[PDB]
Amino acid sequence: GRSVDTMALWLGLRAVLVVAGLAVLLQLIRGWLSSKSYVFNREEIARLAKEHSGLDYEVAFSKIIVELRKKHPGHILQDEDLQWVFVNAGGWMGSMCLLHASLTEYVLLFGTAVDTGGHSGRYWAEISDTILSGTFRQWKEGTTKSEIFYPGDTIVHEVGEATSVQWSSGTWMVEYGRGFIPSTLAFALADTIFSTQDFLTLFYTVKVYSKALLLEASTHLSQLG
Amino acid sequence: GRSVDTMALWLGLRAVLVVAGLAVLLQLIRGWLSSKSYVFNREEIARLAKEHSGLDYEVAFSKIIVELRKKHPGHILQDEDLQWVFVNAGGWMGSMCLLHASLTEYVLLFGTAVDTGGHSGRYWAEISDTILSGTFRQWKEGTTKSEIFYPGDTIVHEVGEATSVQWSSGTWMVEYGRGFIPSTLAFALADTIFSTQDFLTLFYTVKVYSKALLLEASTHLSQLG
Amino acid sequence: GRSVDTMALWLGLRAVLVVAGLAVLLQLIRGWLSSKSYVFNREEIARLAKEHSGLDYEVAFSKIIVELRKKHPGHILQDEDLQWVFVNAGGWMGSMCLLHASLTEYVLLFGTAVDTGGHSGRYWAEISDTILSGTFRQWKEGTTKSEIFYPGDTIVHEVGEATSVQWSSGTWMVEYGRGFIPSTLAFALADTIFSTQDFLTLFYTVKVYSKALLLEASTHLSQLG
Ligand SMILES: CC(=O)[C@H]1CC[C@H]2[C@@H]3CCC4=CC(=O)CC[C@]4(C)[C@H]3CC[C@]12C
Ligand SMILES: CC(=O)[C@H]1CC[C@H]2[C@@H]3CCC4=CC(=O)CC[C@]4(C)[C@H]3CC[C@]12C
Ligand SMILES: CC(=O)[C@H]1CC[C@H]2[C@@H]3CCC4=CC(=O)CC[C@]4(C)[C@H]3CC[C@]12C
């Protein structure tokens, strides 16, 4: 009767429990043992973005791209491959311009011209965002209160951390990611597959990632000869 | 090692790339060669909605429905088949009252009593919305700035265009769509299937579409005899 | 030609129609005949939350938990099993602290530190929320206008009802659910499966539900001996 249904429900919940737990365990295993070849560091990107956060954000964009090319030649996409692509993920909607991407790092410009918010995602990568313009509200797991960050602040989304994120219209920022970057892709594409159905945006997203990987491989080949 | 994983990732990304690209190509093929039998035009609907946008939006609703019935008898649903149905799509939530729908056109009242926003969808159809009340912020692909539209303005979502859309509470509008209307359905229903699980709302949505199609077929039969 | 495509579309829409309708019918059948063993009632929970809604919401949380333990020993989770877990559902993002859960009832603290909103869900359960802090805007199906509720108000989400819900940052409330509780799970988890990909949050959610079920079974066993 009622006790039987309760027991059956508990059995099914324990099934879902062990499945989810082993998925998390495999995420931890794949991420921890993942490669860690690093061309940038988050403090360098943050300091560079904070220096230009008082400028108009598009002027800051240009100055940051020029400086990053100067300091890391062979690791930033050429002008012809720069493109604003919508990002729909975790219930929020923004847009990105990818500058660099490999198995273990990425650098991009990110922001939004609408008010939006949702789930940050949870993955084996450390993400850092330095605000050029607007506001970034972050709400961490396990708390009932959130915090608002302003131009020149850096927000660090730690490995394995989940937060709610919310951005006001006109919020633009410089983002650096470090860790097992492919493990973000399921989060990065899910709203496209299951909500927006925007397959041209998926095309753009995988296209720029593949171009960034090809650039990195080409630079590696040139550095070995 | 790391180069092997990079190459494998690039191969998988190229796979996803060609799949998405051929899906887009098939969307273009199906839409371009789709039928184009047109009973309305977007300028007619826009001018009629703009004329009544200074009225209370529900008075405007009634006056617009009466005028559309007068000008296109046999192509607007009867009072008994008018119903407000929630629409959950692309991360936003509004509601619609379908007035007309065929393979190639639709006319509906649309809006929201909550603040909401998300992805517009991308499909082979030209959508036009004339605001009776509230505000419509549109953020186009490839730009970092958005624009706000007010009562009496018409917003045109062009064929193959993707935007972010955001509406304030109390935003109501008259919508006309033209193109390959079935190709919108995947976008129109996805949040229901994968987010809200609201199967009665799905029932309502397909029910009213089928009634509008039956009306159109009946009028076609009467016009041939 | 065009008539053939119209007829085929109508046939497919009728297929989707009967599938959705029979799913709704099965929802009604399973829910109506579901068990109704009740330990709480919504008026008791609402009056207790309203009494403390003038306090700081975290003080209210503590006072409500203490009183519920005093009045229903053996039916509230111990301090060690209290945990704030994100809830991503219907396009909105909040967080919960589960206090009690069985096949037929649940009690939890719920709210959000970000501005958010979306679909309430539609299921065979009566949900009641009493606001301790913030604002709760509710937009019912079939209307073009919404209503805002304030601290001390109770909002009743009726069985089979669908609404849009919207909460401002800092909104916290005491929630009681009564009916066929498992039938909410598909709504409660869908955004996790198809949007956020946050499997650790899924792990937490099924874990606390299973602990609440085990507590209820243990109390039942002690009451029989
Ligand atoms: C804004 C945000 O949450 C970040 C976190 C991980 C980031 C993704 C990381 C992987 C990736 C690499 C690319 O080359 C395209 C952009 C994407 C898809 C990034 C888009 C923005 C994401 C989703
Ligand atoms: C508001 C909006 O984005 C529009 C764009 C395409 C529109 C859909 C077009 C197809 C359709 C026809 C119907 O008969 C029901 C409503 C729907 C499902 C429309 C709902 C509102 C949509 C989704
Ligand atoms: C806020 C809200 O919509 C409520 C309606 C039904 C509620 C769910 C009911 C079932 C359930 C029981 C649990 O033990 C964990 C929390 C959940 C998953 C509840 C989370 C909050 C929900 C989703």
Author numbering:
A (entry chain A), B (entry chain A), C (entry chain A): -5 to 219
Manuscript text:
Fortunately, co-crystallization of the xlσ1R-progesterone complex produced higher-quality crystals that diffracted to ~2 Å and its structure was solved to 2.15 Å (termed xlσ1Rprog-co). The xlσ1Rprog-co structure was solved in the I432 space group with one xlσ1R protomer per asymmetric unit, and three xlσ1R protomers form a homotrimer. However, distinct from the tadpole-shaped density in xlσ1Runknown-lig, the electron density in the ligand binding site of xlσ1Rprog-co resembles a fish with a small head, a wide body and a short tail. Meanwhile, the 2.15 Å-resolution structure of xlσ1Rprog-co readily allowed a clear placement of a progesterone molecule into the fish-shaped density. The C3 carbonyl oxygen on A-ring of progesterone occupies the fish-shape’s head proximal to the ER membrane, whereas the C17 keto methyl group on D-ring occupies the fish-shape’s tail reaching towards the distal space of the β-barrel lumen. Progesterone binds slightly closer towards the membrane, mainly through hydrophobic interactions with W86 (β2), M90 (β2), L92 (β2), Y100 (β3), L102 (β3), F104 (β3), Y117 (β4/β5 loop), I175 (α4), F181 (α4), A182 (α4), and Y203 (α5). Interestingly, electron densities corresponding to six water molecules (Water403, 404, 434, 447, 473, and 474) were observed within the distal space of the β-barrel lumen. In xlσ1Rprog-co, these water molecules form extensive hydrogen bonds with each other and with the hydrophilic patches in the distal region of the β-barrel lumen, including S114 (β4/β5 loop), Y117 (β4/β5 loop), D123 (β5), Q132 (β6), H151 (β8), and T157 (β9). Water403 also forms a direct hydrogen bond with the C20 carbonyl oxygen of the progesterone tail. Thus, this water-mediated hydrogen bond network connects bound progesterone indirectly to the receptor.
